[PDB]
Design a binder for this molecule. Structure first.
Ligand code: ZN
Ligand code: ZN
Ligand code: ZN
Ligand code: ZN
Ligand code: ZN
Ligand code: ZN
Ligand code: ZN
Ligand code: ZN
Ligand code: ZN
Ligand code: ZN
Ligand code: ZN
Lengths: 115, 116, 115, 115
């Protein structure tokens, strides 16, 4: 995958499973154009979002749906998504794994960018 | 302070000093409208951004400039900003502190929301 | 303060208040000698742990008590403490803030080391 | 795998490759006894550390060597290790993945525990 997204639930110590993810690419105007979407697997991963040729250079936003992920815990999170923006392929071709460790009011997110 | 932003450099273990912070609010033509801005202090803190009156319920984005903050390190970051989005005042008025611990390819943020 | 510890609850979005903190300094024998302790304030902070005189060069462990912090959420955490180890004043005189953002199965810590 | 460790370099945005990891278990005399060790792969991962039968309930410390990992960056880190302590299995046999996103003066760890 040129791009994969990993989501972990830092409250329960588990992959975040069957969580909706939206990817956008910043358009000519300021706007976020829909790029790819899906839901995480049993390992918290979302594979197969894009291909090398559709994954052109640009600014990408990854939005992970969180609003009600937390509901069973009794907590409303800081925002209905966890989002991370990254600038891609601006020096040539690269695989990106976006790793998110999520809590209702905190998250850590790392971009692992390889050959 | 209804809204405070605190920025830490996780690479050198210090406050991120004199860093530009721009706050936006989602405008409902769905664009981000400029809301407040400032530069972090010697303690990495940014106070005085808004007033309990301007600071209504809504969706806010805190954009921390990092385009060149890493330059002396010789690393170009994952993105030219660090952004944190939060929904405010979904249930009455609150003080928000957005704490961002930053690295070039990572970051950890917690929103601390107090009722005072 | 030569040493202060600040604890945030990443689940609830609030300072972690009245939480026990233990500080140790590594002895001659590999043993952790107790150094200072307390409970966090209403701001999640623990001030007044040490004096610049008592804060001699060495390896320090900060242990934040988390075992039952989470009890009301119905979650038992990964460990009964959140712990961070740092090597101190290896160059002169310096003030440390140890900042911990805590969830049951994740934490982020950073050492802010000044002047 | 009962215990897997995955290390990411949060400064460069890559897997931390060929990094030494030592695992310890809290022993009878309150010391840390050596329990397993290895080096991270090209994916930042360390598999094969232990066996279901070796990995009994207890308190485990994962120590990641970071003494010179940062040297080329010109920064000496907060400590010569990144250590994560967890209380294993405390409810029956589980698989553990300890994910550590590392910077010189910070870190985020997450324990993923799966049944
Ligand atoms: Zn894949
Ligand atoms: Zn969605
Ligand atoms: Zn959003
Ligand atoms: Zn800006
Ligand atoms: Zn203020
Ligand atoms: Zn941006
Ligand atoms: Zn303790
Ligand atoms: Zn103090
Ligand atoms: Zn070691
Ligand atoms: Zn394995
Ligand atoms: Zn150590």
């Amino acid at each position: 995958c040129p791009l994969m997204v990993k989501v972990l639930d830092a409250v329960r110590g588990s992959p975040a499973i069957n969580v909706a993810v939206h990817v956008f690419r910043k358009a000519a105007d300021d706007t976020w154009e829909p790029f790819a979407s899906g839901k995480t697997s049993e390992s918290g991963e979302l594979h197969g979002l894009t291909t090398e040729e559709e994954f052109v250079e640009g600014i990408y936003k990854v939005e992970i749906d969180t609003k009600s992920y937390w509901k069973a815990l009794g907590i409303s999170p800081m925002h209905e998504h966890a989002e991370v923006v990254f600038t891609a392929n601006d020096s040539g071709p690269r695989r990106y794994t976006i790793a998110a460790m999520l809590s209702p009011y905190s998250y850590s997110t790392t971009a692992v960018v390889t050959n």
